[PDB]
Write a protein that binds this ligand. Structure first.
Ligand SMILES: CC(C)(COP(=O)([O-])OP(=O)(O)OC[C@H]1O[C@@H](n2cnc3c(N)ncnc32)[C@H](O)[C@@H]1OP(=O)(O)O)[C@@H](O)C(=O)NCCC(=O)NCCSC(=O)C[C@@H](O)C[N+](C)(C)C
Ligand SMILES: CC(C)(COP(=O)([O-])OP(=O)(O)OC[C@H]1O[C@@H](n2cnc3c(N)ncnc32)[C@H](O)[C@@H]1OP(=O)(O)O)[C@@H](O)C(=O)NCCC(=O)NCCSC(=O)C[C@@H](O)C[N+](C)(C)C
Lengths: 402, 402
């Protein structure tokens, strides 16, 4: 299929079946980095993402579009021929839906013994009858993993946003596939990978949860963007708006205490000389620390705080709003935000490829394709006759091609 | 170095320098999957994570511990010998700190032309003088990327939690390194990777931000855990506690409207027959929808809602608290939470390896090592004499070994 040769993944053949964020995100990351990536959509329906007015232009770029009923007679027979040339297949469904419908890993490996198979689901490929076959979205994975309960204010739990768990899960699928791809080069044998969204999110929520699993208490939720345990960490207000900061390190603490008027606290039994973090709940002086930090910050502008925090090696930043991003000199300097052309010739704006590969940078070579745009070009590459693909179209096995 | 042969990454040699979450997380994921992973700590100081009472037992497991002043005379000379046997090196610092201190990518490639180098920083390896060399933590990356402003309640922005951006950045580093590792096998030439935390997070926040970049408005923040745009999506309350749900799909909407008493809305100009999502702000009936959903949900228990939502293929889940995770039958069935022994022989509880590799599952083979635990065993493997390592210890170039 005609495509520029670029990125660390040039000439890798990746195929994905899935809607919305998680599976498509996993597959599309391959295409950001120069892989040949085929997006499978249903025949009668199309990927739900297409309902979004702008995002899909970013989230489906560099992709080739396919419409095949991958479960029916000849539609199934081509999917399996396709799999013989594919290095990596990502599928996102309700549990072992592929296996239930006949496309086992064993069936897939009969067509390609080397194939890497990444299964993405809410609850896993196996488990109990109650959960294994349930549908899931980001929010369901946040709820079930204990991530949701950790987010929000003291009195109001809420999801991390936008759709955080869908990005973690898709990114994990990309990572695990690439690791499995490595193993295939070493041994010539394929792999199957069972990525459960709740299990991904369980991991991402362990920083304090590990306290609960090993004798401790669980942490509370943040109060108004402030770290639940650590003073001087999180959302603060200066004289002229919100900043973030992290009071971390021996020197940072010594010098910051001196500024806010707490010099005399340094060297006491509960704050000995090598102290690199202050726990707000364990420390009787924790609230005092907050009171003085808050009071000292409200006196200074964001610019004055930044200048002094730079002198002390204290990490901080202005809380930026979306309209402030484009003109930020760091963004401009690094071309963090760029433009490209859509398939119909409009100009599209949004993030550049990330991260930056030095020797083999990714690039944007195609806009989002339309439903089944390349279904006819792929089936013909897979050896199917000109008439043969006309017969797939008619029987409703292959679709759109508009 | 003595270690079991397992996982898709068996026999891969990975080295990382970094503290807290982001860099160490990137490097440790390799070890979850059977790579030989060397953790570098400073000589006089030790990784800040060690201050946490339990988490490091999970986040530093399967690792080999090294203490070398990687910038001083002979300490530097060994780091570079080590690099000659290393496949992947992950470093997390303030911008191009390694280059500034003399360890360029060019210097590194003179020792190993194949080496994959992953640079993790807040603001990138290059940019403007104002930002490029600034320190960063999760919160700084959330602030600078527009992610922070998207999280929280209508009136109160707050970070996604716990330390969300540190996990995305580290996971991206793992992914990018594995992709670059692939390219080395294809061409025999190494790679350098520039992972800026704000650029990672910019990507993860694009779902609605793409509206702003292309003519639209930016979305508001959630109100009490409810999707800012889409009715029937997010945090809801049943008669006996919090659930999440996603009203998505043609059938799901038709049948749910019928239940909540909104049957008559189906088929109107603004809700035509194929409607798969309802936008709450664009739709005059959006608030009505919420009012009826809320009212119908408050009548039913979580169990009754789940049973009916299963009948209709509507994704949902109980919002679980941490103490509910261990005994969940899906968790138990999949061994999502497991136990292992620490280096000093205590029993440790926490998440199992994720995801599940079928043919080559990861495993937990070692607890977190102590500071410099393996520094003497690594230097001797790298060819340094028994006396030679005694001279490194004394001059303060190599440390702990306790
Ligand atoms: C799709 C899904 C989310 C549940 O929806 P569904 O039951 O309507 O399934 P479907 O894919 O739409 O298609 C229904 C049937 O259609 C079949 N099908 C799908 N593609 C096909 C093809 N090419 N050929 C033949 N059959 C095909 C499927 O196998 C399936 O058959 P089954 O009933 O036997 O399972 C399910 O795939 C699933 O749970 N996947 C795992 C987790 C996952 O990736 N979910 C998405 C997370 S991303 C996310 O959270 C974003 C979201 O929150 C944002 N928003 C608020 C806007 C919605
Ligand atoms: C460490 C860092 C976070 C800023 O701290 P620092 O300035 O104190 O740097 P350091 O690593 O502690 O060491 C200071 C010096 O010590 C040197 N050094 C470090 N290791 C060495 C070695 N082995 N040999 C010789 N020198 C060594 C460093 O090069 C460095 O020299 P420089 O001043 O020339 O830059 C910086 O590495 C950085 O910004 N990294 C990139 C982003 C990153 O990974 N940050 C962590 C995100 S994870 C996260 O967000 C978790 C956190 O939010 C949770 N909590 C609330 C509890 C804190």
């Amino acid at each position: 299929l005609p495509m520029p040769k670029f990125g660390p993944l040039a000439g890798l053949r990746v195929v994905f079946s899935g809607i919305e964020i998680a599976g498509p995100f996993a597959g599309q990351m391959f295409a950001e980095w120069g892989a040949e990536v085929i997006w499978i959509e249903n025949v009668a329906w199309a990927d739900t993402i297409r309902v979004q007015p702008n995002y899909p232009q970013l989230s489906r770029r560099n992709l080739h579009a396919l419409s095949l009923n991958i479960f029916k007679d000849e539609g199934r027979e081509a999917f399996l021929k396709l799999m013989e040339t594919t290095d990596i297949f990502i599928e996102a469904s309700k549990g072992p839906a592929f296996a239930r419908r006949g496309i086992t890993d064993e069936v897939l490996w009969q067509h390609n013994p080397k194939l890497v198979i990444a299964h993405l689901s809410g609850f896993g490929q196996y488990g109990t009858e109650e959960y294994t076959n349930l549908p899931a979205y980001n929010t369901i994975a946040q709820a079930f993993s204990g991530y949701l309960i950790q987010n929000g204010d003291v009195d109001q739990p809420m999801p991390a946003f936008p759709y955080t768990a869908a990005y973690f899960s898709g990114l994990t699928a990309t990572t695990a596939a690439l690791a499995a791809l490595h193993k295939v080069r070493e041994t010539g044998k394929g792999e199957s990978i069972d990525i459960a969204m709740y299990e991904v999110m369980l991991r991402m929520g362990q920083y304090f949860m590990m306290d609960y699993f090993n004798g401790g208490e669980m942490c509370p939720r943040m109060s108004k963007g402030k770290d639940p345990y650590y003073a001087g960490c999180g959302l603060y207000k200066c004289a002229d708006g919100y900043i973030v900061m992290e009071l971390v390190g021996i020197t940072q603490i010594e010098e910051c205490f001196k500024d806010i008027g707490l010099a005399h606290l340094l060297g006491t039994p509960e704050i000995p000389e090598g102290t690199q973090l202050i726990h707000r709940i364990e420390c009787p002086y924790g609230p005092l620390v907050e009171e003085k930090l808050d009071a000292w910050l409200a006196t200074h502008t964001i610019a004055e705080v930044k200048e002094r925090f730079a002198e002390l090696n204290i990490a901080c930043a202005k809380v930026l709003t979306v309209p402030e991003l484009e003109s930020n000199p760091q963004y401009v300097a690094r071309e963090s935000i760029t433009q490209w052309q859509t398939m119909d010739g409009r100009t599209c704006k949004g993030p550049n490829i990330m991260p930056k590969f030095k020797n083999n940078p990714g690039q944007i070579w195609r806009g989002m394709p339309s439903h089944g745009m390349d279904t006819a070009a792929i089936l013909k590459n897979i050896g199917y006759s000109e008439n043969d693909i006309q017969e797939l179209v008619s029987k409703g096995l292959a679709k759109v091609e508009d």
